[PDB]
Design an enzyme around this catalytic site. Structure first.
Site, mmCIF file in Angstrom:
data_model
loop_
_atom_site.group_PDB
_atom_site.id
_atom_site.type_symbol
_atom_site.label_atom_id
_atom_site.label_comp_id
_atom_site.label_asym_id
_atom_site.label_seq_id
_atom_site.Cartn_x
_atom_site.Cartn_y
_atom_site.Cartn_z
ATOM 1 C CE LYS A 161 -3.675 -0.403 2.212
ATOM 2 N NZ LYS A 161 -4.551 -0.723 3.375
ATOM 3 C CD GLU A 170 -4.782 4.159 11.162
ATOM 4 O OE1 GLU A 170 -3.926 3.389 11.649
ATOM 5 O OE2 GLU A 170 -5.987 3.847 11.048
ATOM 6 N NE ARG A 171 -2.134 0.126 14.375
ATOM 7 C CZ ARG A 171 -2.695 -0.053 13.187
ATOM 8 N NH1 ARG A 171 -2.062 0.263 12.069
ATOM 9 N NH2 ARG A 171 -3.882 -0.649 13.113
#
Ligand SMILES: Nc1ncnc2c1ncn2[C@@H]1O[C@H](COP(=O)(O)OP(=O)(O)OP(=O)(O)O)[C@@H](O)[C@H]1O
Ligand SMILES: Nc1ncnc2c1ncn2[C@@H]1O[C@H](COP(=O)(O)OP(=O)(O)O)[C@@H](O)[C@H]1O
Ligand SMILES: [Mg+2]
Lengths: 85, 86, 458, 56, 86, 460, 115
Positions: F156, F182-183
Site C-alpha cells: 500500500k 493512525e498509529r
C-alpha cells in the site's frame, strides 16, 4: 375521591362451581347472583417451607404422551409452552 | 387451576407499568415481571395436615390440601431466549 | 370558550376553564382560516388542559385560536341512508351527491356486546378458492384474516372473496378503506356501480393520504355502521382493506401524547387498542357480521407485535408468503401456517379432515427433504422420499387457481371450484392415482379433470 | 472389461457430483451470511434502543 | 416526475427526526416514515375532467390531467424484505 | 480581553458562558490558558442563555470552573500554501515536527461550503497514473474518489509513494496526506520512508494520532482538505490521501456520543450521511484545478451491508484491491485485476477501443482462472490447442501487468518506468490479438512498455 | 465458623438470582441500565460477595455453587463473569441431557485448575 381502607377482595365458595365470573366477582353467565362462602383477599402470601408437604399422588391428563412421559402430581407446576395454534 | 395465557398477563402489566412511567427493562418489560409470575406461581402448593387443621380451626383433620397449576406460554417462532418465557 | 396552547404535528393542546373541561372523548371544532377543523379529546392533563387529535390537516393553526366545545362524541349517520354512498371518517358524504338523509346518528365510541349476548354458529360457508376452503375453511359469522407482506395478493384475494361470497349472501355489506391506495377505492367504487350491486354495499374511505386522526377513527366508524345494520336482525358482511394502518396511526400518534414507547416502537396500549376495535365486531344472537380483514405484516416479520397480537382474535387465519408468490403459485397461501377453528371432523367431516391433514403431512416432509436436496441433490434420497417429493410438488402446483378478478394480469379464464371437487382431487393425488401426469399439468387449473386435459396437450 | 469400464464411469460421476455439492455449499454460505449480518445489525439496534430509552 | 432516491430522503428525515428526540422504531426510522412516503407518492394521479373544470374555473373543459411518478429505491445486497423497500 | 467563563467540564466537553451580545457562532474557536498551555475549544452547540457547548481540541485535564476564555472570531485557521510542503502538522496547523515555524503567507479556515454548481468542470477527464494495471483496468477520473481495499503485507505504502512522485513529476501537482487517527510508530516510519525515497519534498502531512481526543481525529481530515483546496486554487491537480476514512466515521460517532445525541442504525451518529457528504463533496474538479483522492477503506466484520461501508461506497468512483496472492507470485504492484473496478470504464467515457480492450483482458483472465482449477484437478493433457493458446496468452498478460517502480530500484535494481495510456492499451491489444505470441512470458515481466519487452526478448 | 478455625462446607443454590434481585431494583434506585439490561454494578456486586468465600490461614471454606445459564447460552454476562471466580467448573449442557446421558456434563468444556 374517598379512600376506603381495604384491599381488593373477591367472592369465594363452593357456589362458584359452574359459574362464569369476571375479575371482580360479578357473574357474566346471566344465571343469577352467586352463593359465596364469604370473601377473600386477592393478594396474599404463600405458605412457608415448614407448612408444605411433598408430592406423591398423580393426576391424570387423560392423554397418553403426557401421563406416561411427563407425569403431573397433585401440587405440581407444569408449563405448557409452544407456538400459536 | 389453568392460567390460559401468562404472556398476556405480562403484557397487561407492562402496559400498566409504562403508563405509570416506571423505568423499563429488557424488552420494555419492568423488572418485577419475575416477581409477578413468581409470587403468583408459588401460591400453588400442597400443605401438610397441621396447616389444614390450624386454618380450619380444628374442623378438618387428617387431610392435606393441594392445588396443581398449569400455566401456558406462547413462543414467537420458538424463541426460547425471550425474557418472559425464560 | 377555550384556546389552543400547543400544536405538535397531529396532536393539539387546548386550554379550558377549570370548571368547563370536556370529557375524555368529546369533540371540539376550530376555525383554521376560512375552514373548520374537528379535534378529538384523548387525555385530561392538569389545570384544565386537554390533549387532542386533529381530524384534518394541522398546517395553518396558530396558537391562541379559540375553540368551541361540542357536548357529544363524534357521531355518524347510520342505516338505510348510508347504503349507496362514500363517506368520510366524520360521517360526511364524500361522493359529489347531496346530503345523507339519515334519521339517526350513532356515536362511534361504543361498548362491545356482553358475554350472554354472543352466539357461536358452526354453519359452514363455501368459497370458490381451493386452498382457502380446503385448508382453513371458515363458517358464517366468523372473522377471517389475510396475512402477508407487500404485493402478495391480499387485495386481489379479498376481491375474489367479495365476488364469490356475495353469490350466497342476500343482505347489506360494509366496506372500510383503512389507509390504502385511493386508486383501489376508486376502481372498487366504479366496479361496484357498473355491476349494479352498489345499492347494497356501503363504503367508508379514509386512505393513506389522510392525516393520522382520520385513519385512526375511520375503522371505528365503519364498524359502527356495521353495528347498526346488524341490530336490525340482518346478517352483514364487513370488509376491511387494511387493519394494520389502525395500529400504525396509533404508533405515529402515541409518541406525541407523552406515552413511553414499548417494544420495537409500538405504544404501550397496542393490545388494548386492538382489543377495543376487534371485540365489538362479532355475531350476537340478534345479528351476524361475517368479516374479512387484511393484515399487512411489516418487513415480512410474522414475529412483529402487531401481527402477533392479531392471531388470537381470528377464527380463520390465512398466511400469504413471498417465496410461494415468487414461484408464480397464485394464490400464494402458505398451507403450513394457515389454520382455522372449524377444521375439526365433528364439524367439517372426516374425509375433508383427513385430506387436509395428509396434505400438511406431505408438505412438511417435503420441507424436511429440501435441506438435504440443497446440498446433495435429488439422487441420494430414498425411493419413497423421491415419491413424496414428486407428489408434494404436484400438490403445490394444484393449490394454485386462476381467479376471475385476476384475468387482467394473466389472460387465463377464471375458475370456481366446489369443495367436493377439490377434496376429490387432493385425495386422488395423495393416494397416487395421478402419478402418471407431469407437474406442469397441475399449474393454474381448476378441477383435476382440467389437469388431465392439460396433460394431454402437455 | 464391462466391470472396469463401469468403475471408470463411477469415478467420473462421483467427481461431477462432488463439484456440484461444493458449488451448492458456497451458495448456502453466501446467503446464511446475509441472514447473519441482518440479524447482528438488528440485535445491536434493539439493544441500543433499549439502553437509550431506559435512560429516561 | 422522477425521484432520484426516496431512501435517502428517508435518511434525511430520519436525521431530522432523531435530532428532535423522537423515539424511533424498526431500523431506527421514525414511526411516520410510512406517512412521509405515502402522502408524497399519493399526489401522483389521474384526475377526471370534472375536477379539472372545477379547478380551472371552467377555462379548461373536457380534459383529464395526470402526473406519473417513478421513484427509485436502493436496497443492500438485493433483498426486498427491508423496512423502507417494503 | 477575554469575555467568557467556563461553567462546566465533563470529560472532553466544556461549556462556557458569554454575555448575550457576544455569543459565538456555531463553529467558532475559543482559547483557554489551561495550566501554562493554551487550549483550543471548538464550539458545537449554542444552548440558551449565552452558554455554548464545545469540544476541547486537546487534553481536558487541569481545567477549573472559573477560567477566562478568549473568543476568536474565526474558526480553526491553518497555514496553507507551498510552505507546508515537507512538514508534519497537527489539527491546528502547528508543527509536530521539530524543524521550526512554518513561514506561511496565508491562513485559511478549515470549514467552508463545497464548490457551487457553476464551478464544476465543463467536462469529464481521465487521470494517468503511469501504472499499467490501474490505467487499464480502473482508470481514475480527474477529481474522482478511489478506494484502496487492500490489507497489510501488500504494498500500500509503495503505491502511495509512486503516485506522489508521478503526480509531482509527470504532471505538475502536489499531494496532501491526512493521517486520520493512525498509529504514531507507523506515521514516523512513513515519514522516514518518504525521506529516504526523496518524495517528502513533494507532499505535505497532517497527522492526528490515535491518542488524541475524538475532535482532533474528526477535524484532521478537514485540515488536510483545506490545504489541498489551496493547491487546487493554484490551478494544480492534487492527490489527497486519507489514511483511513473508517476512523473519520468512527470519530464522528464518538463525538456525537459525547454530545449526547441519539444514535441511529447499528449505533452510528444521526448525521452520518451528512458528515460523509461534507467530507466527500469538497473533493471535485473545478473549472481550474482538481483534487483526486485515494482513500483506504476497512469494512467492519467483513459486512458489506454495514452502514459505514454502504455510505462510503456511494461516493467511490473506483475500487483498487491489493492481493497477497498476486504479491506471492512476485508481480508488483499486487493489484488483483478481477476484483478492481472503475465506473469510468465505459466505451462512451474512456473510448471504444480502450473499453473493448479492457473487456477482453478481464474475460481472458477469468477464463484462465477457471482453466487453472481444471488443470489442477485433471491435467494439461485434457486441453485443446485453442485452450492451450488461451492459457499461454493469459500467462503473458498476467506478467505484462507487472511494472518496475522508481522506489523499486532499491528493491530490485530495475531503473523504473512510466507507461502512457496509449502505450499500455497498444501493448495489451497486441498481446490479445496474437502479436508477440512468439515471445517468452518472462520477456514481459517488469519490462515497462511493450517496445521494451521486445528488447528484453532480443537479449533473451 | 471459619473464624472459629473449623473447615466449612457452603452450598449456594443460585448465584444467578442474587444478581437478578439486584437487577429488579437497580432501575428504581435511579441507575442507568447496562449492556443487556443489567445494573451498571454487576461486576462489583458479584465481586464483593464472591471474594469473601475464601480459605484463610485460620480456617477454610469449601463452597459448591449452582449457576443458572439463561437460554442455555454461556455468552451471557452473568455466567461469563462467574466463570472467572472458580477453581473447578463443571459445565452441564442441555444437549447431553436431551440425549439422555446423565449427568449431562460436557467433557470438552469442564475443567479444573487442579488438573
Ligand atoms: N392470481 C393472482 N392473485 C393475486 N395477485 C396476483 C395474481 N396474479 C398476479 N398477481 C399480482 O400480484 C399483485 C399483488 O396483489 P395485491 O395488491 O392484492 O397484494 P397485497 O398483498 O394485498 O399488497 P398490498 O398490501 O401492497 O396492496 C397484484 O397486483 C397482481 O399484479
Ligand atoms: N514494487 C516492489 N518491489 C519490490 N518489493 C516490493 C514491491 N512492492 C512491495 N514489495 C515488498 O512487499 C512489501 C510491501 O508491504 P509494505 O508496503 O511494507 O506494507 P506496509 O506499508 O503495511 O508496511 C515491501 O516492504 C517489500 O518488501
Ligand atoms: Mg394489494
Amino acid at each position: 375521591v374517598k379512600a376506603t381502607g381495604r384491599i381488593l377482595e373477591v367472592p369465594v365458595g363452593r357456589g362458584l362451581l359452574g359459574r362464569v365470573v369476571n375479575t371482580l366477582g360479578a357473574p357474566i353467565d346471566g344465571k343469577g347472583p352467586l352463593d359465596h362462602d364469604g370473601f377473600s383477599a386477592v393478594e396474599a402470601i404463600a405458605p412457608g417451607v415448614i407448612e408444605r408437604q411433598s408430592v406423591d399422588q398423580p393426576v391424570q391428563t387423560g392423554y397418553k404422551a403426557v401421563d406416561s412421559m411427563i407425569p403431573i402430581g397433585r401440587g405440581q407446576r407444569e408449563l405448557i409452552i409452544g407456538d400459536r395454534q | 387451576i389453568i392460567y390460559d395465557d401468562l404472556s398476556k398477563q405480562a403484557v397487561a402489566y407492562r402496559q400498566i407499568s409504562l403508563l405509570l412511567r416506571r423505568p423499563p427493562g429488557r424488552e420494555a418489560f419492568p423488572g418485577d415481571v419475575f416477581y409477578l409470575h413468581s409470587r403468583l406461581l408459588e401460591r400453588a402448593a400442597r400443605v401438610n395436615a397441621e396447616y389444614v387443621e390450624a386454618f380450619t380451626k380444628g374442623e378438618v383433620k387428617g387431610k392435606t390440601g393441594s392445588l396443581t397449576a398449569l400455566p401456558i406460554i406462547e413462543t414467537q417462532a420458538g424463541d426460547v431466549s425471550a425474557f418472559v418465557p425464560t | 370558550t377555550g384556546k389552543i396552547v400547543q400544536v405538535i404535528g397531529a396532536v393539539v393542546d387546548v386550554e379550558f376553564p377549570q370548571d368547563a373541561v370536556p370529557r375524555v372523548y368529546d369533540a371540539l371544532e376550530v376555525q383554521n382560516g376560512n375552514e373548520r377543523l374537528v379535534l378529538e379529546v384523548q387525555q385530561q392533563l392538569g389545570g384544565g388542559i386537554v390533549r387532542t387529535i386533529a381530524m384534518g390537516s394541522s398546517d395553518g393553526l396558530r396558537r391562541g385560536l379559540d375553540v368551541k366545545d361540542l357536548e357529544h362524541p363524534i357521531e355518524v349517520p347510520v342505516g338505510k341512508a348510508t347504503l349507496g354512498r362514500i363517506m368520510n371518517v366524520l360521517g360526511e358524504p364524500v361522493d359529489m351527491k347531496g346530503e345523507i338523509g339519515e334519521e339517526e346518528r350513532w356515536a362511534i365510541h361504543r361498548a362491545a356486546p356482553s358475554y350472554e349476548e354472543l352466539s357461536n354458529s358452526q354453519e359452514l360457508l363455501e368459497t370458490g378458492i381451493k386452498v382457502i376452503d380446503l385448508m382453513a375453511p371458515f363458517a358464517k359469522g366468523g372473522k377471517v384474516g389475510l396475512f402477508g407482506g407487500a404485493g402478495v395478493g391480499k387485495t386481489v384475494n379479498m376481491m375474489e372473496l367479495i365476488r364469490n361470497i356475495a353469490i350466497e349472501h342476500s343482505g347489506y355489506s360494509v366496506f372500510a378503506g383503512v389507509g390504502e391506495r385511493t386508486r383501489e377505492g376508486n376502481d372498487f367504487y366504479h366496479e361496484m356501480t357498473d355491476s349494479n350491486v352498489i345499492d347494497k354495499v356501503s363504503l367508508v374511505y379514509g386512505q393513506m393520504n389522510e392525516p393520522p386522526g382520520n385513519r385512526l377513527r375511520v375503522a371505528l366508524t365503519g364498524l359502527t355502521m356495521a353495528e347498526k345494520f346488524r341490530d336490525e336482525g340482518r346478517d352483514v358482511l364487513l370488509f376491511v382493506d387494511n387493519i394494520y394502518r389502525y395500529t400504525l396511526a396509533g404508533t405515529e400518534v402515541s409518541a406525541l401524547l407523552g406515552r413511553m414507547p414499548s417494544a420495537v416502537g409500538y405504544q404501550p396500549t397496542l393490545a388494548e387498542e386492538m382489543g377495543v376495535l376487534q371485540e365489538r365486531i362479532t355475531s350476537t344472537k340478534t345479528g351476524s357480521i361475517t368479516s374479512v380483514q387484511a393484515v399487512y405484516v411489516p418487513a415480512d416479520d410474522l414475529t412483529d407485535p402487531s401481527p402477533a397480537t392479531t392471531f388470537a382474535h381470528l377464527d380463520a387465519t390465512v398466511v400469504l408468503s413471498r417465496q410461494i408468490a415468487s414461484l408464480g403459485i397464485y394464490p400464494a397461501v402458505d398451507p403450513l401456517d394457515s389454520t382455522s377453528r372449524q377444521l375439526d371432523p365433528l364439524v367439517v367431516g372426516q374425509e375433508h379432515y383427513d385430506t387436509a391433514r395428509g396434505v400438511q403431512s406431505i408438505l412438511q416432509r417435503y420441507q424436511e427433504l429440501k435441506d438435504i436436496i440443497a446440498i446433495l441433490g435429488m439422487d441420494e434420497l430414498s425411493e419413497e422420499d423421491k415419491l413424496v417429493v414428486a407428489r408434494a410438488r404436484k400438490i403445490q402446483r394444484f393449490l394454485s387457481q386462476p381467479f376471475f378478478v385476476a384475468e387482467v394480469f394473466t389472460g387465463s379464464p377464471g375458475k370456481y371450484v366446489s369443495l367436493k371437487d377439490t377434496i376429490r382431487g387432493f385425495k386422488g393425488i395423495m393416494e397416487g392415482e395421478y402419478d402418471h401426469l407431469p407437474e406442469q399439468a397441475f399449474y393454474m387449473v381448476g378441477s383435476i379433470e382440467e389437469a388431465v386435459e392439460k396433460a394431454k396437450k402437455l | 472389461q464391462g466391470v472396469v469400464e463401469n468403475l471408470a464411469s463411477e469415478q467420473a460421476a462421483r467427481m461431477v457430483a462432488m463439484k456440484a455439492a461444493t458449488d451448492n455449499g458456497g451458495s448456502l454460505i453466501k446467503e446464511l451470511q446475509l441472514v447473519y449480518n441482518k440479524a447482528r445489525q438488528a440485535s445491536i439496534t434493539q439493544e441500543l434502543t433499549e439502553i437509550v430509552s431506559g435512560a429516561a
